[PDB]
Design an enzyme around this catalytic site. Structure first.
Site, PDB file in Angstrom:
ATOM      1  N   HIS A  85     -17.318  23.412  50.206  1.00 34.19           N
ATOM      2  CA  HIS A  85     -18.627  24.019  50.328  1.00 34.19           C
ATOM      3  C   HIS A  85     -19.602  23.053  50.926  1.00 34.19           C
ATOM      4  O   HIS A  85     -19.762  21.940  50.393  1.00 34.19           O
ATOM      5  CB  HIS A  85     -19.118  24.468  48.922  1.00 34.19           C
ATOM      6  CG  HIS A  85     -18.337  25.605  48.392  1.00 34.19           C
ATOM      7  ND1 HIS A  85     -18.275  25.890  47.057  1.00 34.19           N
ATOM      8  CD2 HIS A  85     -17.580  26.533  49.048  1.00 34.19           C
ATOM      9  CE1 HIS A  85     -17.488  26.982  46.932  1.00 34.19           C
ATOM     10  NE2 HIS A  85     -17.067  27.356  48.139  1.00 34.19           N
TER      11      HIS A  85
ATOM     12  N   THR B  23     -21.586  29.375  42.475  1.00 40.78           N
ATOM     13  CA  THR B  23     -20.361  29.668  41.760  1.00 40.78           C
ATOM     14  C   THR B  23     -20.262  28.874  40.460  1.00 40.78           C
ATOM     15  O   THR B  23     -19.228  28.988  39.776  1.00 40.78           O
ATOM     16  CB  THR B  23     -19.163  29.446  42.609  1.00 40.78           C
ATOM     17  OG1 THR B  23     -19.075  28.034  42.862  1.00 40.78           O
ATOM     18  CG2 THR B  23     -19.126  30.249  43.876  1.00 40.78           C
TER      19      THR B  23
ATOM     20  N   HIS C 297     -19.155  19.517  48.739  1.00 42.37           N
ATOM     21  CA  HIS C 297     -18.286  19.271  47.601  1.00 42.37           C
ATOM     22  C   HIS C 297     -17.100  20.187  47.730  1.00 42.37           C
ATOM     23  O   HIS C 297     -17.039  21.080  48.585  1.00 42.37           O
ATOM     24  CB  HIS C 297     -19.055  19.479  46.266  1.00 42.37           C
ATOM     25  CG  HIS C 297     -19.468  20.878  46.091  1.00 42.37           C
ATOM     26  ND1 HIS C 297     -20.677  21.368  46.533  1.00 42.37           N
ATOM     27  CD2 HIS C 297     -18.795  22.003  45.654  1.00 42.37           C
ATOM     28  CE1 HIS C 297     -20.744  22.684  46.337  1.00 42.37           C
ATOM     29  NE2 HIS C 297     -19.573  23.089  45.807  1.00 42.37           N
TER      30      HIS C 297
ATOM     31  N   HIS D 280     -13.632  22.350  45.555  1.00 39.00           N
ATOM     32  CA  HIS D 280     -13.006  22.995  44.409  1.00 39.00           C
ATOM     33  C   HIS D 280     -11.538  22.983  44.605  1.00 39.00           C
ATOM     34  O   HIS D 280     -11.076  23.206  45.740  1.00 39.00           O
ATOM     35  CB  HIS D 280     -13.505  24.425  44.257  1.00 39.00           C
ATOM     36  CG  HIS D 280     -15.009  24.544  44.130  1.00 39.00           C
ATOM     37  ND1 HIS D 280     -15.660  24.601  42.920  1.00 39.00           N
ATOM     38  CD2 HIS D 280     -16.005  24.628  45.074  1.00 39.00           C
ATOM     39  CE1 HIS D 280     -16.987  24.660  43.147  1.00 39.00           C
ATOM     40  NE2 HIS D 280     -17.224  24.705  44.434  1.00 39.00           N
TER      41      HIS D 280
ATOM     42  N   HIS E   1     -18.459  17.813  37.519  1.00 43.40           N
ATOM     43  CA  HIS E   1     -17.911  19.141  37.864  1.00 43.40           C
ATOM     44  C   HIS E   1     -17.164  19.237  39.125  1.00 43.40           C
ATOM     45  O   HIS E   1     -16.221  20.090  39.300  1.00 43.40           O
ATOM     46  CB  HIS E   1     -19.017  20.159  37.857  1.00 43.40           C
ATOM     47  CG  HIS E   1     -19.831  20.187  36.588  1.00 43.40           C
ATOM     48  ND1 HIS E   1     -19.327  20.643  35.364  1.00 43.40           N
ATOM     49  CD2 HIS E   1     -21.028  19.766  36.334  1.00 43.40           C
ATOM     50  CE1 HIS E   1     -20.241  20.518  34.459  1.00 43.40           C
ATOM     51  NE2 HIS E   1     -21.328  19.949  35.070  1.00 43.40           N
TER      52      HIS E   1
ATOM     53  N   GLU F 123     -11.962  29.056  45.549  1.00 43.55           N
ATOM     54  CA  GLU F 123     -12.814  29.990  44.828  1.00 43.55           C
ATOM     55  C   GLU F 123     -12.698  31.377  45.410  1.00 43.55           C
ATOM     56  O   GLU F 123     -12.325  32.335  44.725  1.00 43.55           O
ATOM     57  CB  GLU F 123     -14.262  29.498  44.824  1.00 43.55           C
ATOM     58  CG  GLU F 123     -14.395  28.083  44.266  1.00 43.55           C
ATOM     59  CD  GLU F 123     -15.637  28.003  43.450  1.00 43.55           C
ATOM     60  OE1 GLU F 123     -16.722  27.768  44.040  1.00 43.55           O
ATOM     61  OE2 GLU F 123     -15.571  28.183  42.207  1.00 43.55           O
TER      62      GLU F 123
HETATM   63  C1  LIG Z   1     -29.251  23.380  44.694  1.00 44.07           C
HETATM   64  C2  LIG Z   1     -28.240  23.892  43.677  1.00 44.07           C
HETATM   65  C3  LIG Z   1     -27.647  22.722  42.844  1.00 44.07           C
HETATM   66  S1  LIG Z   1     -26.390  23.329  41.654  1.00 44.07           S
HETATM   67  C4  LIG Z   1     -25.099  24.012  42.722  1.00 44.07           C
HETATM   68  C5  LIG Z   1     -24.866  23.709  44.041  1.00 44.07           C
HETATM   69  F1  LIG Z   1     -25.588  22.854  44.698  1.00 44.07           F
HETATM   70  C6  LIG Z   1     -23.840  24.372  44.754  1.00 44.07           C
HETATM   71  F2  LIG Z   1     -23.718  24.039  45.991  1.00 44.07           F
HETATM   72  C7  LIG Z   1     -22.939  25.350  44.184  1.00 44.07           C
HETATM   73  S2  LIG Z   1     -21.625  26.283  45.147  1.00 44.07           S
HETATM   74  N1  LIG Z   1     -20.310  26.069  44.373  1.00 44.07           N
HETATM   75  O1  LIG Z   1     -22.006  27.645  44.901  1.00 44.07           O
HETATM   76  O2  LIG Z   1     -21.612  25.887  46.462  1.00 44.07           O
HETATM   77  C8  LIG Z   1     -23.243  25.556  42.820  1.00 44.07           C
HETATM   78  F3  LIG Z   1     -22.478  26.391  42.142  1.00 44.07           F
HETATM   79  C9  LIG Z   1     -24.235  24.892  42.117  1.00 44.07           C
HETATM   80  F4  LIG Z   1     -24.488  25.292  40.849  1.00 44.07           F
HETATM   81 ZN   LIG Z   2     -18.966  24.960  45.408  1.00 44.12          ZN
END
Ligand SMILES: CCCSc1c(F)c(F)c(S(N)(=O)=O)c(F)c1F
Ligand SMILES: [Zn+2]
Ligand SMILES: CCCSc1c(F)c(F)c(S(N)(=O)=O)c(F)c1F
Ligand SMILES: [Zn+2]
Lengths: 261, 261
Positions: free
Chosen positions: B115, B196, B89, B91, B64, B102
């Site tokens: 993020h 998100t 990570h 986007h 993803h 986002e």
């Molecule tokens: C501990 C959660 C693991 S799944 C996860 C995530 F880590 C995120 F940082 C995000 S984000 N994109 O909101 O930072 C996310 F969407 C996720 F689904």
């Molecule tokens: Zn994110």
């Protein structure tokens, strides 16, 4: 049923309305990178829009918007089929964030948006049959901003008092619906998309006029505060606000414009 | 098997992931009608962000995004608990449309978004536990615009041809993560929101810095062409592009700013 808020809001529409998660979804952001002038997009002709002053037209609060029924002799000329009118309705925001158009232009909402819904009457007998069919529908969209008082929009808004709650109905004497259209209707955006409400069928030819109309600050506030989604007797009333869908992804596609300038 | 495009894209997430159709969803459009200055929003302090260049940190393509694992001694000071880092990570959009942030600001997308994910390590033993608890997570968001080459982001990007496919892992030498943050980190937007992506838990305290960073066109193109959502042997490859959620409704919610103006 479906709503614009809370558990039954737009991210959940696809459970019971699968086309809401399918192709060609509307609305979209209209921005310069995806616009392409198309000299083939000639002006539409609005026929039968001057509704008989002697005929009354049914206005309804359907729990989602306020809708005016329109007669099937009203139609657009210029498209591949005749598209005959069936209803008009509006989408708006709320007084704390009065930016409730569905389409956006360069990322910006307008205050509200009027849709005049037509169906392909050469192919189908009525709008309800056309709505899930190929080439079924054509919608005209007018972007609305706060500015000067608009007597024509008031021909609809003066009746909002009588359709306050879901299910309520009132009659509007005919008037010239073309008065609701903006300046330079020759200038528009065109794309293939969908209903912006459930069932979200991908069956709409969209025409979004380039230029907005104006309504006063009091008219916009009236629109935003006059109606409820709920039946009159509901012990938990809900104001009808923010009745617009978020913009959809739109990638590797164009919106065609009738204007280059 | 959720995705960002097609049948299993974001309008369908809520079919499998009910919180995606629930309250407090992210991301949002940051615009004046929903902003309010809050003088209590004092500066965050970034502790243990200067990761040792003699250590290495695991980079993983998770189908993803790309994520870099971060050590729990790295933390934010200034919130109501200690929040320790877990991963970062990004986007992004695609080569022909490098507009994949986002969050948006006044209706405009940025090229990409970083993020940095933290979890309340005072209360929970790991981020997966924290993630289903209110305010269990705190995410820092950095808006990325196309501009100058950024050597610091390149410490991540230079390892991407090495994590092209789902399940692949690489090691990235430590560097100072604070170098990924923009100018005047004291200036930020704060709001309660969600993950998100599925499962969209409404458990995130968001901090979106006011000021963007820049990365180059070449860095964006590398990012946007390096990665696949699918395994290296998948006969139906899918490019990891356009991996951002549309903005969500946010009414009744307010976003608090650490800057007046
Ligand atoms: C501990 C959660 C693991 S799944 C996860 C995530 F880590 C995120 F940082 C995000 S984000 N994109 O909101 O930072 C996310 F969407 C996720 F689904
Ligand atoms: Zn994110
Ligand atoms: C069955 C004929 C009218 S139903 C309908 C509708 F409610 C809309 F909101 C739209 S909208 N909002 O996409 O114009 C629409 F196109 C429709 F067709
Ligand atoms: Zn409509």
């Amino acid at each position: 049923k479906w709503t614009y808020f809370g558990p039954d809001g737009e991210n959940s529409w696809s459970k019971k309305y699968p086309s809401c998660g399918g192709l060609l979804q509307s609305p979209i952001d209209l921005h310069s990178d995806i616009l392409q002038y198309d000299a083939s997009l000639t002006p539409l002709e609005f026929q039968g829009y001057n509704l008989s002053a002697n005929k009354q037209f049914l206005l309804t609060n359907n729990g989602h918007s306020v809708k005016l029924n329109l007669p099937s002799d009203m139609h657009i000329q210029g498209l591949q089929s005749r598209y005959s009118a069936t209803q008009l309705h509006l989408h708006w925001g709320n007084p704390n964030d009065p930016h409730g158009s569905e389409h956006t232009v360069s990322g910006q909402h307008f205050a509200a948006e009027l849709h005049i819904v037509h169906y392909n009457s050469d192919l189908y007998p009525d709008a309800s049959t056309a709505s899930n069919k190929s080439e079924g529908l054509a919608v005209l969209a007018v972007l609305i901003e706060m500015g000067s008082f608009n007597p024509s929009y008031d021909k609809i808004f003066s009746h909002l008092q009588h359709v306050k709650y879901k299910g309520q109905e009132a009659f509007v004497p005919g008037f010239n619906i073309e008065e609701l259209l903006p300046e330079r209707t020759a200038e528009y955006y065109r794309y293939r998309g969908s209903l912006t409400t459930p069932p979200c069928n991908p069956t709409v030819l969209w025409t979004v006029f380039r230029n907005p109309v104006q309504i006063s600050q009091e008219q916009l506030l009236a629109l935003e505060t006059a109606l409820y989604c709920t039946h009159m007797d509901d012990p938990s009333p809900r104001e009808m606000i923010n009745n617009f869908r978020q913009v959809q992804k739109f990638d590797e596609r164009l919106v065609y414009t009738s204007f280059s300038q």
